[PDB]
Every structure is written in structure tokens, then in C-alpha cells.
């Protein structure tokens, strides 16, 4: 039994990567350690994907052991699944197009230095393990937390350094790109936020470098996977009789009339092929039509044509703000933007831990049935309001906000930030200033790129980069980003954030006008 | 965004129905409010039922939000699923015969006036929402709680008015019929109980009227669903060679010999058709035989013939009562009636909340396997005993009863009322008087109707109305009814209840004789 | 309703078996009682096994009612599932070869005498019920707990008699054989342990005798089940072209080269038959090859040939011991034996209840994916360490050990006993002496038998008897056995245990050398 260690300094802290001695049956496993906070990360990738499949089964697990802090207790906890998401987000888009083999990443914290948060350490481990595994993965990736103290950027600030920080942000990217950003801020500017992202992305390059060396020394041979064929002949004679007819069908304004022409196009086209050949699995055929359709829309947006509902790239849907909606609640509000709506409440009684945010996403919000996601959205919406909350001494009452997503087709989470803002004011909570959220999208093709404001549910495919921003008129309180494409520069981000600031301000304008 | 409100007085309270502004994606949604207690009720009905299906997927969800009462907590709770049942029961039989599309009703309490119970308010909402939806539904329905104070009926008594009430009953019906009744009473008479049912049914008509007007103004177009064809030709030549042979097979007394003749009939008949045609899906064929069989029995009972086990409409199965069955329990009993049996226990130690009733229904009670319903049955059996419990000052001990349904083929819940009665006496609990329960059935055809005492498990199909009654010799402590047919008048109910009183008394006679 | 009782003295205690009055719908049900501790045990066996099936669905359920002890609470609990295992283990191998009908045994405690443990009483019940049922079952079985006080064996010692006992062991067997043993001991000798097993097996014969009489008087007619045909013609011409080639393929040492020759053999053989006949369900064909293969190995081991990995019957895989592996834990260790590994931890802070053992078995330990068995293994490993723990007054600190099975291919549980030993020493816990565990196997054919040390994961089929032993250099702290074959005498056990003592000592030698 012989371990392979690789050590390096990651600004102020020493990071060690040990592999080859533990869990040798996993596809690859790494014990990442950073100044006494150790997370053992493992990875298993099934060798053969089910027949056809049609869906990449990627699942990350983050477990925190209480013995890791020298304590005896007396799931998974929501916080644990939040960090699992923090790891899943950046690595998920790096798996090649077509890879549908099951992959499970398990991260479990084995030792904890109360000053060094296990999260980025676990992210580092998942990147190392995945890279060493040889599973088709276009990594590695780095991970960094950026703080803001004395108006200067800080690299991986300790838990108490954060007490004097005005920013808590996490960025993860490869060598040439930022993939995901998750943050909470005390009303900073897009420019300051952008600087944290770029700073972090650069500072973490040290990590991607070491992982690379370790892969040279201990890495396994890259799988000889192979994408698995695409019937580019079938979906060639599908586009042959639908492509053009559809690009025209998308020019007719009457919404319900557009579906008709499309449905005709999809009906005629399928029947015509089932007559040429046959036994062609309509399902797959319809699956191809849906694709040239999503591309017809992608081509129209890039060309400057109206979005699917008629809006232009910067248009926000119709707002509607109502306060004091429920009789016996300390504070209620009904914020609705287009087709996504949120009923929000505030209750008081004898910061966070003093501030509680709960999110509910019933199935009827999307006109469906099902059991009665609301976990990651809740944390985002909470970060979006944190900046505005009173100093506890200014308001000695624990406050709890609850959001009911009654409608959804845009971004329930951003909508619940606005409702929370309103409800708290309706409850008499002395919040620093109203706060609002907006969900954006960025579609790109070569150099032609377009920023979208208030993305629809069915505009998700245009989100080569979809991001959320929340704050008041004076600054950004929360910023979340997820990039799945390359290119997209810091300059392009500046543009994107600016258009998002506009949308925010527009929404605040309507909000401030509601609560006179 | 424009809401449609409809307001009306519901005796002492003002009821408001708001629709069209929230959750516009649900098939229909209503915010029902009654003197500050608001429940937002929603409804979603899938447009297309699975292929064939053979089973109506109706599911109701009742959620109570703690913020609704201005409080911060610190599922679903059993009480929440009890009320979900309270809503499901009356609306479930109103969906046309053959409708198998999925339907989900979600009711969530958004504001609570401690004096106005959210339950009837949620029932009202589910009726409004369902009606407005346009889903094939023969409603609406009303809902009312009836109390008994100063020997007079009370409409929707407040929580503290109930402290001076001797009756807590809930009735729900359409315009021409009562569909379900759930109650708890302090030993009243069938006549007084009947008066509460009828009174409530009339008083709630105001509700069905307003819902109707709202449907005129805001209702959606009725679905163009259509029942979906019945092969009345296949199950015509199935009855052609089985109908008569079966009506005779049901005249032979030897139980095990009767099955034989039937099984022969079912075997020969299926084989004969598979020889005429073929590829006829035996399963469906057997599914048709089971139907003319259940009808042969239905025709025999209406004609005055003996039930399937030999009994006459008023006969109760053989009883058997045993006390002090378990060595170390404060109180035990083994009550068995026919083929349904209950092992019941009582434990004491330092009213309800002081009185706890738990129910267990293992799978071997029906000769089956499975995980180890016992929730709605438990509440019923508890109401059945409540009336008899001592005044707490007369007996300063919290008491807990547990019922184990060791056998089942009639009504485990009524059996557990009898066992609880016995066990408590065996434990020395100064109960006012012994109490017993009986599960009845009412089968009707035009004007010819028959009341059945102590219904069997496989007599459930004869229950056009099946109901339960429990009490002592002096009165009724619990009454539960579920009607799925029209006609059945108050006069017919009087008859039914009377035959049930007889059965009760008969059981009490045997019980009182056990515990000398 | 008429019950059939059968009473008899079981040394110091009176055992009563009542059947025929409760749960008459279960295939059979018995109320077993022993000096006031009563457990009602039931059994249901589906009459027809699914089509083909290929897997015996046996499931035991043990429930403990709090009213059984005259108390009001205020799952199943892990302890409850431990006892369910205690019942499942001995009865599971008694179901004839080929029986795949579902069988569920439910045991629920109805009365508890704090002195007489419900467990053996429930075991007795499951044996009685199963026997009476008539389900194909080669029982009955008995059950006995054996204590060790004043250097003499004790039959079913009471809970406080155990306070002065140096042994807590449970044995269950038929008339001619011991099937399962589960124990915890204060460092006794194999000889003393063996004496408890044999003593218990003899003492419990009184039980198997009475159950037999009761079956004569009340038992049901034995099912006319019938094994269900084996295509001994197909797997005759599979062995015809694979048997010999495989027995040779298993002589080549190169591991990866052996698989190759085998895979060729399996490939060629299947293709050749699919050419003779066809539509032969390869799956079933491969299912037959796997069988003559497992038999080729079984024949080689009995003949004295090397095991599949090259080892001889007494060889233990390569060890590796590491201490102080994690930075902030009070005590850590990395014990690895061959391909099974355990990361173990110890945390201190303000015997058992004062001693906590938790076990984790992630799916990557076997190179697989899945949800994140670890319950029965944890209890065993804990018993394995109990003997060594300080007298609480010698060490006033509650200690908690956690084991992470990072690798598995032998016996994670025995490995976690060794790690726990180490970790506790690393934490400074004054344990009496180091302790280790070994998992053995015994393969038998007529009179030729072979004992295997440190069984592999894929050697499980050679375990006609597989057992585990744990202890220090001075004695045995835990002993678990599971026999699925007949013959195997006490003399043969003596041999087996002795070879296991050797393995233990060998492991302790390496361990004591690690922690200098």
C-alpha cells in the first residue's frame, strides 16, 4: 500500500493531495487537506451506460461528520445538500456531450479546522478525484472563496475574517473559464462583484496547476469512451421538411395561432416520414423536431427578432404588486411578474439564525400534479435579503419569511426576493431599503451574443449563461452565475450585469410605487 | 391581473371567494376566506388519462402553515391528513363514472382566526375550485359544522362555543343529497344526530348557491371529456353463459362447495370464449365475470335472499369477548366479531391530549404480506370512546389505548371501539358506561332498499351507503356516513340508524355479560 | 373460537404456546409467553411464487410495544431490526432449496417482564408459527441464551443475573444442528465459548420437542409445494463444453490472464449453443456457467489447491496499519487487510450508552454507486471491543467510535474492530489490551472439510459455515456463527475456532508492532 502525495501553498494555507492509499475500489479517490480541514472525496463512474438512456445521471453527496470537529452528536442536513450543489454545479457541464454513464461523487468531511471551511476543500477534492479517474471530464476546476475587507480582495478568508468582510463569494472555473459563482454581498457594485469573480478565478489557478501535475504522476488512463453516434441523416430529412416551415411559423404573433401552425408542421412531417420508411419511433422523430425548433428560436434571438412571447432582449414582463393580502399575518405580499408569482409572508417573535427563510414550490405552480428544489432557491432568496436586514439591536425580533411559489415560468427565487422585501415592510420590519431580484440569460454564437432579461421557463435553452442578481438601488446583495459555454469574457460579463442592474431598478421602481 | 370576488353571509360569518388572480396555471384555484381564516385551494386535472388505466387517481392535500397564526415553529401531521380525508370523502363520488384522469387538490391554510376552524373553509374552497375548473364534477357541495347548545342546533360553532356543545358534527352534500358525515357526540339520540345532519345540509345550501353564481361569472368551460366506451357486447356474451349458472351457484350453502361451482363456471366460460374468438385478454374476461357475480349477490340481497355467508340483513356475526388477556398490561381485551378481531390495551400514568388512541393494522390481519389506513380508523374509534371517559378530576390519569387489528373482514374500527371499552374497564378506568360500535351498509335500487348489519369485507360493493355508529345504551358517541348514491332520504336514514341501534345494543348485551 | 394451549417448563421458567384463537387469517400465528413476557408472532406465506422469480423473499419484522411494559411513550428502532435479524438468521436456511414464495414473519411484543428478554421468546414464536403453518420449512428450531456465572453455564439468565455474567450468547439450532450463534464475551476461551454453544443447543431441545407435539395436535397440513424443475439437461451440455476448460483456466496464476481465458470459455460456449438451438436466453446460460465455475473453485479448495487469489487455507492477506491519520480527531486509524479497509475514529467527552459505535458503508467501498447493512456490522464490531473498555471509573469519559468502510472484499466488520482498537489507543483511551477480528469460512463435502481464513467477498459461496471471532491475546470478546449445512460437529468447530485464533494472533502481532 503506497500513497502519492502532492503538496502546494494556496496563499496563506497549505493544501495537500493524497491519493492511492484509500478506497482503491472507487474509480478514483482523493484525501484533500487544507490547514487541518480534511475532506475525503471519492468518485465512481459506471463502465457502461444503460441502453440509449437519454440522460446523464450525475449525483454529488456531501456529508459532514461531527467527529471531524472532535464532537459527539446528541438526513442530509439542508446545509449539506447546499454544498453538494456547490460541487455539482461547476463539474456538471464539464462532462462531454453525449456522456450518459452514471457518475457519483461522494465527499465526506473527516477533520475540521473551525477556521477553514470544508466546502472549497471538498470542491477541490471532487476536481482532483474526477481528473485522476480518467472518466471523460474536461477539467480540472479550481475553487476559491473571495472576501472583501478594507476595500481589498481576500483569498479564502477564515470564518472570523469574514466577520469583517462585506462579501462572501465562491467562484469555480477551469483554466480558460469561470463556470459558477455563488455569493452574498453587503450591497457592493457590479464592478466590485466582477472583480471578486475575476480575482478568485485567477487566484485558484494554482489549484488547477497542481491537480494537473498529480494527474501526470498518478492519474489513470483516460477512458476510451466515445460519444456514441448521432443519426445525422434522420434529423437531416426531418429538418428537410420542417426547418423552413417552422422558421416561418415563428413569425406569426398570435400565440395560440402559432402553436397551431407548428403542431400542423409537426403532424404532417411525422406522418410523411412514417410513410417513406416506417417503424421510425415517432417519439424520436418528435424529439428531433423539438430540436430544430429550439434552434429556430435561438437563431431568431441572435438575429434581433422578438423573443417567443413578443418581448425584446431587455423587456421585463408585466408586474403587479399587492400588500396586506392575508388577514392575520404580521406581513404579507403578492408579487407577480408575468407568469411567475409568489405569495410571501413575514412573522415576528422573540444576523441569520435570527433570520429564517423558507421556500415552498407546489406542483400546481407549473400546472402539474405531484408531491408537496425549494431548498437552493430559498438560500439564494435569503442572501438576496440579508444585506437589507436591521442590525438586530435596531430591531430585537427574530424574523421569519415564507414564500409560496403560486406560479412559475421565469424565476420564482427572484420573485420571492421581491415579495420578501414587500412583506417585511408590510410587517413593519425596518429594512434598510427595498430589494429586488432578476433572472437573466446570455445566448452566444461565436462573437454575436445577446443578454436576456427576465428569462422565461422555456427560454432555459438559450442560457449558455444564466445568472441571477438581487439588491437595492445602492448595490448588489446576491449574485449567482452558471456558465456552460466558453468565450464569454469579463467584458461581456460587465455588459450582462449592467443590463441586469437596469431590470432590477425597473422592478424597484414599480415596487417602491406600490408601497407608496 | 384582475381578480373576481364573490361575497356572501354564511350565518354569523362572512365568506369571500376570490379567484382569477393567483396560481393561474392550476386548472382552477380559489382563495376562500371566512372571518379572517383563509385557505388557498388549488386544483389540477391532467388532460389525458393514461392508456386504459382502470383507476381514478384522486388525491387531496391539506397543509397548515404556522405563519397563518402569526407564529414561528420550533410531515404531514396526522391532523392534516385527517382533514384531507374530510375533503376527499365528499368530492370523490361526484366524479363521473369512468373518469380516470389524475386530479390533485391542494389546500393550504394562509391565515387563521383561532375561532373559525380552517377545515370547512378548505372544504368550501375545494368545491369552488373543482366547480370552476370545468373538470367533469357533479358538484358543487357545501360543508357545515353543527353544534348542539341549549338543546338547539348551532351553525359553524366557534372553538369556544364548542366548549359548551354536546355535539361536533360535519356534513357535506350537494343540492339534493348528503354525501358524508363525520361526527363526535356526547351520547345523543339517533333522532338528534339526524336533525344535525339535515339541519347542516340545509344551512349549507347558501354555499352551493354562491359557488354556482361564481361559476356563471368566472367558471371555465366544462371539459369535453366523454366517459370512454364500454364493450357492452363482450360482457353480454359473458353473462350469456355465466349469468344464470352463477345465480344458481349462489344458492348452494356449502361455502367451499359454492366457490367450486363458481370457479368451474368461471373456468368453463373463459375457455369457451377463448375458443370462439381468442386473444381476448382473459384478465378482462375474468374482470367481467366478477361483475355479474357481484350483481347476482346484489340482486339476491334486494330480493330478501341470505347474504353471502348465510346471514339475514339484521344478523350480527358470532361474538367472543375476553378480558385480562395480557400479563403485564394495565388493561387488555380480545374482542372478536366474526372474522374481524382486535387486541386492545390500556396504559395509565401521570379531555384528549390526556387521552391517546393509537391504531395498528398489520397486513396479516387480511392474510397478506406488506409494510408494517390505521389513522382515520383511529380517530373514529377515539371519538367513539370520548363520551364515556371520566371528567379528568374524577380520574387524574392520562390514559392511552392501543388497538391491534389481528383480523379484519368487517370493521376493525368498530371492533376497536368495543375492545377499548373492555380494556379500559379491565384497567380500572371509571368510564361512564360500556360503549360499542357497528359498521352498517345500505343497498338501494329504485325504491327497494335493504339495510345491512355488520357488513363483511367483501360486501363493500353493496354499500351505496355505508356508515358507522358507536355509543353506549344511552346514546350515540360517534357517527360516520358516506353516501355514493342519490335518493336515500332522511326517512330512510331513520330506519337505517334504528337497525344500527339494535346491532349496537345486541353487542353491548354480550359485552356487559362478559365483564359480569 | 377455541384456542389450543401447550405448556412446558424451560428451566426456571414456564413457557406457554397458544394458537388458533388469534389472527386466524395469517397462515399460522402463535402467542408465546414466558414468565409474563409475551410476544405474538404471526406468519404469512403467499400461495404462489411470481413467475420464475429467482429469489426467496423472506422478511422478518420485530416490533416492541411500549405498553407492553406498562408505559406511555413520549421507526423501527435499530435494536428492533437487530432482533429481527436474530430471528431471520436461523430460520432462513431451513426453507427448502428452490422455495421462492414470499414469506413474512411479524413478531410484536405485547407484555414485558423486565427480567425475561422478549428476543428468545420471539424466536420461539417464529419457530412455532412457521412449523404450524405447514409452509415448506425444515424446522423447528429452538433458541437459548447462555450466561457464564461462577464459571458455570446458565440457561436464559435474567437481566440482572447478566450483571454477574461474563458471557451473553444466543444459539439457535434444529434437533441435529446449530444454525446461528451471536455473542459478546468478557475474554473467554474458544473452549468456553464452544461449551456455551453446545450447552445451549442441548438445553433448548426441550423447546423443539414441545413445538413438535403442538404441530401434531394443531399443525396444518404441509403444503404440497414441490421444488419446481431444474433443466438438468441444459446445464449438462453447458458443462459439457465448459466444465473441463474452466477447471484448467483456474490453474493459471496471472489473475487478469485467468479472467481472459474464462471470458473466452464463457463467450465461445454460449455462442456455440446459440448455434445448436437458439432463443436460449443467454442470461440463463451465463447463469449456468457461473455455477460450474463456483464449483470448480469449490472442488479445488477441497482438493488442497490454492484459493482464487493464490492463498492457502490459512493465509491472511497483506496488512497495513496507520495511526494519527486525521489532524483534528481525538483518535484515528487506517487499518487495511488485503482489499477491505476501514478508516476509524474515536471522540471523547463528558458501560455502553457511555460507549457508542457507529458504522458507515458507502457504495464506493465496492466500486459501486448508490444511496449513502451498516447496522448489524456495527453491533458486532461493538461487542468485539466492549471487553477491552475501561471500567468507567478508570476512565470517566463517554467514548464514541466511528468506522468508515472505505474498501470491502473480506469483512469490513472485523476490520472495523481492529481500527477501533487502534483509534482508541491513538486517542489515549486506556483499553485493557489491543483487540482484533477475523472472518472465517468452512467448506464441507461429506467428511472432507476445509477451514478458510480471512474469506474474500467472492468466497462467500464456500461458506457452508462462515463465522467471525474477535478478541485480544487473552480471550474471545465476540463470536458470531451462521451454519447452512448439516454434519459439522463440535469437534469440527474446535478446529475451526483454533485456526481463527491463529489468524487473530497474527493480526494482533502486526497491530501491536504498529503502535510500537
Residues facing residue A153 across a β-bridge = A148
The whole-angstrom separation of Cα A470 and Cα C205 is: 76
Closest of A389, A383, A391, A398 to residue A431, by C-alpha: A389
Contact between residue B183 and residue B168 where contact means Cβ atoms under 8 Å apart:
yes
Cell of residue B224, nine digits: 369535453
Neighbours of chain A (3+ CB pairs under 8 A): B, C
Cell of residue A510, nine digits: 414599480
Exposure on the CB side of residue A234, measured as CA atoms within 13 A: 19
Exposure on the CB side of residue C169, measured as CA atoms within 13 A: 33
Helix/strand/coil for A479 = strand
Helix/strand/coil for A380 = helix
* Residue at grid coordinates 483569498: A155
Q: Give me the CATH topology for the region A232-311.
A: Arc Repressor Mutant, subunit A (1.10.10)
Cell of residue C167, nine digits: 458471557
Asked whether the CA dihedral A271, A277, A281, A285 is positive or negative, the reply is negative
Neighbours of chain B (3+ CB pairs under 8 A): A, C
Contact between residue C136 and residue C93 where contact means Cβ atoms under 8 Å apart:
no
The whole-angstrom separation of Cα B458 and Cα B455 is: 8
Contact between residue B329 and residue C67 where contact means Cβ atoms under 8 Å apart:
yes
The three-point CA angle A157-A162-A163 to 5° equals: 155
Residues making up chain B, counted from first to last: 516
Cell of residue A293, nine digits: 425548433
Backbone angles phi, psi at B399, to 5 degrees: -120, 140
Reported as type and span, the H/E element at residue B7 is strand B4-10
- How do strand B399-407 and strand B355-360 relate by DSSP bridges? parallel
Exposure on the CB side of residue B405, measured as CA atoms within 13 A: 30
Cell of residue C371, nine digits: 444511496
- C-alpha dist (Å) from residue A455 to A309, A383, A466: 11, 21, 9
User: What is the DSSP annotation of B366-404?
Assistant: GT------TTHHHHHHHHHHHTTS--SSSS-S-EEEEEE
- The domain ranges of chain A are 1-218, 232-311, 317-516
- How do strand B28-34 and strand A144-149 relate by DSSP bridges? unpaired
Residues facing residue C22 across a β-bridge = none
Per 3-state DSSP, chain B is made up of helix, strand and coil in percentages (nearest 5) of 35, 25, 40
Mutate to test the interface with C, among A5, A30, A64, A67 (most CBs of C within 10 A): A67
Do the Cβ atoms of C407 and A22 come within 8 Å?
A: yes
- The set of residues, in sequence order, having a beta carbon less than 8 Å from that of A167 and lying 6+ positions away, is A146, A147, A148, A183, A184, A185, A186, A188, A192, A193, A196
Alpha helices of B92-158 — where are they, by DSSP H?
118-133
Quick one: closest CA in A to B22, which residue? A406
Those residues of chain C whose CB sits closer than 8 Å to some CB in chain B are 1, 21-27, 29, 33, 36, 38, 40, 42-44, 46, 59, 61, 63, 65, 67-72, 102-104, 106, 108, 110-113
Mutate to test the interface with B, among A364, A426, A427 (most CBs of B within 10 A): A364
Helix/strand/coil for A242 = coil
B391 C-beta neighbours (distance < 10 Å), count: 9
Helix/strand/coil for B290 = helix
Exposure on the CB side of residue B13, measured as CA atoms within 13 A: 27
Cell of residue C328, nine digits: 483534528
- C-alpha dist (Å) from residue A478 to A156, A471, B390: 18, 7, 60
Exposure on the CB side of residue B427, measured as CA atoms within 13 A: 32
Contact between residue C382 and residue C364 where contact means Cβ atoms under 8 Å apart:
no
Residues facing residue B281 across a β-bridge = none
Instruction: Confirm or reject CATH 3.50.50.60 for domain A1-218, answering yes or no.
Output: no
Beta strands in A266-375 (DSSP E): 319-323, 331-337, 340-348, 355-360
User: What is the DSSP annotation of A193-241?
Assistant: HHHHHHHHHHHTHHHHHHHHHHHHHTPPPPP--------TTGGGSSTTT
The three-point CA angle A350-A354-A355 to 5° equals: 120
Contact between residue B429 and residue B392 where contact means Cβ atoms under 8 Å apart:
no
Contact between residue B168 and residue B184 where contact means Cβ atoms under 8 Å apart:
yes
* Residue at grid coordinates 378482462: B284
Prior bond to C76 cis, omega within 30?
A: yes
| CB contacts, 8 Å: B368 with chain C | 44
Contact between residue B339 and residue B407 where contact means Cβ atoms under 8 Å apart:
yes
Query: B69 CA to chain A: closest CA distance, Å?
Result: 7
Backbone angles phi, psi at B480, to 5 degrees: -125, 130
Those residues of chain A whose CB sits closer than 8 Å to some CB in chain C are 1, 21-27, 29, 33, 36, 38, 40, 42-44, 46, 59, 61, 63, 65, 67-72, 102-104, 106, 108, 110-113
Cell of residue B131, nine digits: 366547480
The whole-angstrom separation of Cα A89 and Cα A481 is: 10
CATH topology agreement for domains C232-311 and C317-516: no
Cell of residue C261, nine digits: 481465458
- C-alpha dist (Å) from residue A512 to A381, A436, C487: 19, 10, 87
User: What is the DSSP annotation of C63-115?
Assistant: EE-GGGGT-------HHHHHHHHHHHHHHGGGS-TT--S-EEEEEEEEE--TT
Cell of residue C137, nine digits: 420449512
Asked whether the CA dihedral C416, C417, C423, C429 is positive or negative, the reply is positive
The whole-angstrom separation of Cα A88 and Cα A80 is: 12
Closest of B291, B278, B279 to residue B238, by C-alpha: B291
The whole-angstrom separation of Cα A230 and Cα A227 is: 9
The whole-angstrom separation of Cα A462 and Cα A452 is: 9
Do the Cβ atoms of C40 and B343 come within 8 Å?
A: yes
| CB contacts, 8 Å: C23 with chain B | 341, 364-365, 406-407
The whole-angstrom separation of Cα A245 and Cα B178 is: 57
Per-residue DSSP letter, C317 = P
The whole-angstrom separation of Cα C46 and Cα A202 is: 66
Question: Considering just the CA atoms, what is the radius of gyration of chain C in Å?
Answer: 24
Per-residue DSSP letter, B159 = T
Exposure on the CB side of residue A6, measured as CA atoms within 13 A: 24
Prior bond to C451 cis, omega within 30?
A: no
State the angle between helix axes of B78-91 and B376-386 in degrees (0 to 180), rounded to the nearest 10. 100
Per-residue DSSP letter, C316 = P
Mutate to test the interface with B, among C2, C22, C25 (most CBs of B within 10 A): C25
Contact between residue C453 and residue C440 where contact means Cβ atoms under 8 Å apart:
yes
b/e code B183-208 from CB counts within 10 Å (16+ = b)? bbbbbbebebbbbbbbbbbebbebbb
Beta strands in C121-243 (DSSP E): 144-149, 152-155, 167-173, 178-188
Residues facing residue A343 across a β-bridge = A334, A404
Backbone angles phi, psi at C493, to 5 degrees: -70, -40
Experimental technique:
X-ray
The three-point CA angle B370-B373-B379 to 5° equals: 145
Top-level CATH class of B317-516? alpha beta
Q: Which residue in the set C320, C329, C372 is minimally distant from A63, CB to CB?
A: C372
Residues facing residue A63 across a β-bridge = A108
Contact between residue B451 and residue B496 where contact means Cβ atoms under 8 Å apart:
yes
Q: Which residue in the set A345, A367, A370 is minimally distant from B25, CB to CB?
A: A367
Looking at chain A, the residues that come just before a C–N gap of over 2.5 A are 74, 350, 372
State the burial class of residue C361 (Cβ atoms within 10 Å of its Cβ: 0-12, 13-18, 19+).
Answer: buried
Cell of residue A200, nine digits: 478568485
Reported as type and span, the H/E element at residue C122 is helix C118-133
| CB contacts, 8 Å: A67 with chain C | 329, 345, 347, 400, 402
The whole-angstrom separation of Cα B82 and Cα B76 is: 10
Prior bond to A140 cis, omega within 30?
A: yes
Query: C330 CA to chain B: closest CA distance, Å?
Result: 33
Question: Considering just the CA atoms, what is the radius of gyration of chain A in Å?
Answer: 24
- The set of residues, in sequence order, having a beta carbon less than 8 Å from that of B86 and lying 6+ positions away, is B119, B123, B170, B182
State the angle between helix axes of B490-514 and B190-203 in degrees (0 to 180), rounded to the nearest 10. 140
Residues making up chain A, counted from first to last: 516
Do the Cβ atoms of A328 and B112 come within 8 Å?
A: yes
Where residue B79 falls (left for φ over 0; alpha for ψ -120 to 50; beta otherwise) is: alpha
Per-residue DSSP letter, B67 = G
- The set of residues, in sequence order, having a beta carbon less than 8 Å from that of B141 and lying 6+ positions away, is B90, B91, B94, B123, B127, B172, B173, B174, B179, B208
Helix/strand/coil for B58 = strand
The whole-angstrom separation of Cα C234 and Cα C218 is: 43
Cell of residue C34, nine digits: 414466558
Residues facing residue B147 across a β-bridge = B154, B168
Cell of residue C498, nine digits: 483454533
| CB contacts, 8 Å: B110 with chain A | 326, 329, 343, 345, 404
Closest of C167, C186, C194 to residue C476, by C-alpha: C186
The whole-angstrom separation of Cα A491 and Cα A489 is: 5
Mutate to test the interface with A, among C319, C327, C355, C398 (most CBs of A within 10 A): C327
Cell of residue B121, nine digits: 373553509
Backbone angles phi, psi at A240, to 5 degrees: -60, -35
The whole-angstrom separation of Cα B414 and Cα B511 is: 14
B155 C-beta neighbours (distance < 10 Å), count: 18
Q: Which residue in the set B25, B43, B71 is minimally distant from A365, CB to CB?
A: B25
Provide long-range contacts, Cβ within 8 A and 24+ apart, for B242-248: B242/B266, B242/B269, B242/B289, B242/B292, B243/B292, B243/B296, B246/B289, B246/B292, B246/B293, B246/B296, B247/B296, B247/B299, B247/B300
Amino acid at each position: 500500500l503506497n500513497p502519492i502525495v502532492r503538496k502546494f501553498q494556496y496563499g496563506q494555507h497549505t493544501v495537500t493531495l493524497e491519493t492511492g492509499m484509500m478506497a482503491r475500489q472507487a474509480t478514483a479517490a482523493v484525501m484533500v487537506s487544507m490547514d487541518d480541514t480534511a475532506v475525503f472525496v471519492t468518485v465512481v463512474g459506471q463502465k457502461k451506460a444503460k441502453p440509449g438512456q437519454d440522460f446523464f445521471p450525475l449525483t454529488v453527496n456531501y456529508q459532514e461528520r461531527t467527529y471531524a470537529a472532535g464532537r459527539i452528536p446528541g438526513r442530509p442536513s439542508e446545509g449539506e445538500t447546499l454544498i453538494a450543489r456547490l460541487i455539482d454545479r461547476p463539474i456538471r457541464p464539464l462532462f462531454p456531450e453525449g456522456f450518459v454513464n452514471e457518475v457519483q461523487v461522494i465527499a465526506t468531511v473527516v477533520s475540521v479546522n473551525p477556521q477553514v471551511n470544508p466546502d472549497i476543500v471538498a470542491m477541490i477534492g471532487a476536481s482532483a478525484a474526477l481528473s485522476l479517474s480518467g472518466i471523460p471530464f474536461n477539467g480540472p476546476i479550481g475553487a476559491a472563496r473571495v472576501g472583501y475587507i478594507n476595500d481589498q480582495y481576500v483569498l479564502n478568508p477564515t470564518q472570523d475574517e469574514l466577520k469583517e468582510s462585506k462579501l462572501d463569494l465562491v467562484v469555480a472555473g477551469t483554466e480558460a473559464a469561470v463556470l459558477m459563482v455563488e455569493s452574498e454581498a453587503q450591497l457592493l457594485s457590479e464592478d466590485q462583484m466582477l472583480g471578486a469573480v475575476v480575482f478568485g478565478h485567477e487566484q485558484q489557478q494554482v489549484v488547477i496547476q497542481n491537480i494537473n501535475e498529480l494527474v501526470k504522476e498518478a492519474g489513470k488512463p483516460r477512458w476510451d469512451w466515445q460519444p456514441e453516434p448521432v443519426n445525422e441523416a434522420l434529423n437531416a430529412r426531418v429538418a428537410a421538411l420542417a426547418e423552413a416551415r417552422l422558421s416561418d411559423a415563428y413569425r406569426i404573433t398570435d400565440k395560440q395561432e402559432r402553436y397551431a401552425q407548428v403542431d400542423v408542421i409537426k403532424s404532417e412531417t411525422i406522418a410523411t416520414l412514417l410513410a417513406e420508411d416506417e417503424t421510425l419511433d415517432e417519439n424520436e422523430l418528435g424529439e428531433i423536431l423539438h430540436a430544430i425548433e429550439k434552434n429556430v428560436v435561438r437563431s431568431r434571438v441572435l438575429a434581433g427578432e422578438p423573443r417567443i412571447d413578443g418581448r425584446e432582449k431587455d423587456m421585463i414582463r408585466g408586474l403587479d404588486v399587492r400588500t396586506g393580502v392575508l388577514p392575520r399575518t404580521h406581513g404579507s405580499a403578492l408579487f407577480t411578474r408575468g407568469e411567475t408569482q409568489a405569495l410571501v409572508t413575514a412573522t415576528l417573535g422573540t444576523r441569520t439564525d435570527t433570520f429564517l427563510f423558507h421556500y415552498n414550490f407546489p406542483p400546481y405552480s407549473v400546472g402539474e400534479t405531484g408531491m408537496v428544489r425549494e431548498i437552493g432557491h430559498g438560500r439564494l432568496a435569503k442572501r438576496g435579503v440579508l444585506a437589507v436586514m436591521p442590525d438586530m439591536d435596531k430591531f430585537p425580533y427574530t424574523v421569519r419569511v415564507v414564500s409560496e411559489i403560486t406560479e412559475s415560468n421565469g424565476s420564482s427565487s427572484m420573485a420571492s426576493v421581491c415579495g420578501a422585501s414587500l412583506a417585511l415592510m408590510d410587517a413593519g420590519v425596518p429594512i434598510k431599503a427595498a430589494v429586488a431580484g432578476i433572472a437573466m440569460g446570455l445566448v452566444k454564437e461565436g462573437d454575436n451574443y445577446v443578454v436576456l432579461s427576465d428569462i422565461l421557463g422555456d427560454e432555459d435553452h438559450l442560457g449558455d449563461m444564466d445568472f441571477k442578481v438581487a439588491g437595492s438601488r445602492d448595490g448588489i446583495s446576491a449574485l449567482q452565475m452558471d456558465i456552460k459555454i466558453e468565450g464569454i469574457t469579463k467584458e461581456i460579463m460587465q455588459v450582462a450585469l449592467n443590463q441586469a442592474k437596469g431590470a432590477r431598478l425597473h422592478i424597484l421602481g414599480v415596487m417602491e410605487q406600490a408601497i407608496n
